[PDB]
Protein backbone atom coordinates (compact mmCIF):
# COMPACT_ATOMS: atom_id res chain seq x y z
CA UNK A 1 0.00 0.00 0.00
CA UNK A 2 1.04 3.68 -0.11
CA UNK A 3 2.65 3.75 3.34
CA UNK A 4 5.28 1.24 2.24
CA UNK A 5 7.02 3.83 0.06
CA UNK A 6 6.98 6.65 2.65
CA UNK A 7 10.27 7.80 4.12
CA UNK A 8 9.11 7.02 7.67
CA UNK A 9 8.11 3.42 6.89
CA UNK A 10 10.47 0.50 7.51
CA UNK A 11 9.58 -2.98 6.26
CA UNK A 12 12.34 -4.82 8.10
CA UNK A 13 13.38 -3.11 11.28
CA UNK A 14 13.18 -4.64 14.74
CA UNK A 15 12.32 -2.85 17.99
CA UNK A 16 15.97 -2.59 18.99
CA UNK A 17 17.11 -1.51 15.52
CA UNK A 18 14.51 1.25 15.62
CA UNK A 19 15.69 2.43 19.06
CA UNK A 20 19.27 2.35 17.80
CA UNK A 21 18.29 4.77 15.04
CA UNK A 22 16.12 6.99 17.23
CA UNK A 23 18.77 7.31 19.92
CA UNK A 24 20.95 9.17 17.39
CA UNK A 25 18.38 11.90 16.82
CA UNK A 26 18.30 14.05 19.99
CA UNK A 27 14.93 15.62 19.27
CA UNK A 28 11.45 14.99 20.59
CA UNK A 29 9.04 14.23 17.76
CA UNK A 30 11.45 12.03 15.86
CA UNK A 31 9.62 8.92 14.68
CA UNK A 32 9.35 5.97 12.35
CA UNK A 33 6.84 3.24 11.62
CA UNK A 34 7.91 -0.40 11.40
CA UNK A 35 6.05 -3.55 10.44
CA UNK A 36 5.83 -5.99 13.35
CA UNK A 37 6.44 -9.75 13.22
CA UNK A 38 2.75 -10.43 13.74
CA UNK A 39 0.17 -10.13 10.99
CA UNK A 40 -1.64 -6.82 10.43
CA UNK A 41 0.44 -5.09 13.13
CA UNK A 42 2.76 -2.05 13.01
CA UNK A 43 4.61 -0.04 15.62
CA UNK A 44 5.19 3.67 15.76
CA UNK A 45 8.54 4.21 17.50
CA UNK A 46 9.07 7.79 18.59
CA UNK A 47 10.92 10.18 20.85
CA UNK A 48 9.04 11.99 23.61
CA UNK A 49 10.10 13.41 26.99
CA UNK A 50 13.68 12.48 26.04
CA UNK A 51 12.86 8.77 25.82
CA UNK A 52 11.96 6.28 23.11
CA UNK A 53 8.42 4.93 23.18
CA UNK A 54 6.57 2.37 21.10
CA UNK A 55 2.88 2.19 20.35
CA UNK A 56 0.99 -0.35 18.29
CA UNK A 57 -1.24 0.20 15.28
CA UNK A 58 -3.54 -2.54 13.94
CA UNK A 59 -4.55 -3.01 10.30
CA UNK A 60 -8.26 -3.84 10.26
CA UNK A 61 -9.31 -4.46 6.70
CA UNK A 62 -9.75 -1.11 5.01
CA UNK A 63 -8.84 0.90 8.11
CA UNK A 64 -6.15 1.16 10.77
CA UNK A 65 -6.72 1.57 14.49
CA UNK A 66 -4.60 3.24 17.13
CA UNK A 67 -6.24 2.48 20.43
CA UNK A 68 -9.78 3.77 19.83
CA UNK A 69 -8.81 6.14 17.00
CA UNK A 70 -9.66 4.95 13.49
CA UNK A 71 -7.98 6.13 10.26
CA UNK A 72 -8.34 5.36 6.56
CA UNK A 73 -4.75 4.16 6.28
CA UNK A 74 -1.31 4.35 7.84
CA UNK A 75 -0.59 7.41 5.71
CA UNK A 76 -3.68 9.20 7.00
CA UNK A 77 -2.82 8.21 10.58
CA UNK A 78 0.67 9.67 10.37
CA UNK A 79 -0.60 12.84 8.68
CA UNK A 80 -3.12 13.28 11.50
CA UNK A 81 -0.47 12.88 14.20
CA UNK A 82 1.83 15.36 12.50
CA UNK A 83 -0.97 17.85 13.02
CA UNK A 84 -2.41 16.72 16.36
CA UNK A 85 -0.59 15.45 19.46
CA UNK A 86 0.06 11.70 19.67
CA UNK A 87 1.53 11.52 23.13
CA UNK A 88 0.73 14.08 25.77
CA UNK A 89 1.28 17.35 23.88
CA UNK A 90 3.86 16.07 21.41
CA UNK A 91 3.22 15.75 17.68
CA UNK A 92 5.12 13.58 15.23
CA UNK A 93 7.67 15.94 13.67
CA UNK A 94 10.82 14.32 12.27
CA UNK A 95 10.41 11.21 10.12
CA UNK A 96 13.48 8.99 10.33
CA UNK A 97 14.58 7.30 7.10
CA UNK A 98 17.78 5.57 8.20
CA UNK A 99 18.97 2.22 6.85
CA UNK A 100 19.80 -0.54 9.31
CA UNK A 101 23.20 -1.34 7.84
CA UNK A 102 24.91 -4.69 7.39
CA UNK A 103 28.66 -4.36 7.74
CA UNK A 104 30.20 -6.73 5.21
UniProtKB/Swiss-Prot annotation:
What note about domains is in the entry? Answer: The SH3 domain mediates interaction with CLNK. The SH3 domain also mediates interaction with RALGPS1.
* Localization: Cell projection, Lamellipodium; Cell projection, Ruffle
Q: Which gene encodes it?
A: Plcg1
Query: What's the protein here called?
Result: 1-phosphatidylinositol 4,5-bisphosphate phosphodiesterase gamma-1
Q: Its biological function?
A: Mediates the production of the second messenger molecules diacylglycerol (DAG) and inositol 1,4,5-trisphosphate (IP3). Plays an important role in the regulation of intracellular signaling cascades. Becomes activated in response to ligand-mediated activation of receptor-type tyrosine kinases, such as PDGFRA, PDGFRB, EGFR, FGFR1, FGFR2, FGFR3 and FGFR4. Plays a role in actin reorganization and cell migration.
For the SH2 domain, which residue ranges apply?
8-96
The full protein's residues present here are: 664 to 764 of 1290
Provide the record's note on post-translational modification. Answer: Ubiquitinated by CBLB in activated T-cells. Tyrosine phosphorylated in response to signaling via activated FLT3, KIT and PDGFRA. Tyrosine phosphorylated by activated FGFR1, FGFR2, FGFR3 and FGFR4. Tyrosine phosphorylated by activated FLT1 and KDR. Tyrosine phosphorylated by activated PDGFRB. The receptor-mediated activation of PLCG1 involves its phosphorylation by tyrosine kinases, in response to ligation of a variety of growth factor receptors and immune system receptors. For instance, SYK phosphorylates and activates PLCG1 in response to ligation of the B-cell receptor. May be dephosphorylated by PTPRJ.
**What high-level taxonomic lineage is stated for the organism?**
Eukaryota, Metazoa, Chordata, Craniata, Vertebrata
Coiled-coil spans in chain: none
How this chain assembles, per its entry, is:
Interacts with AGAP2 via its SH3 domain. Interacts (via SH2 domain) with RET. Interacts with FLT1 (tyrosine-phosphorylated). Interacts (via SH2 domain) with FGFR1, FGFR2, FGFR3 and FGFR4 (phosphorylated). Interacts with LAT (phosphorylated) upon TCR activation. Interacts (via SH3 domain) with the Pro-rich domain of TNK1. Associates with BLNK, VAV1, GRB2 and NCK1 in a B-cell antigen receptor-dependent fashion. Interacts with CBLB in activated T-cells; which inhibits phosphorylation. Interacts with SHB. Interacts (via SH3 domain) with the Arg/Gly-rich-flanked Pro-rich domains of KHDRBS1/SAM68.
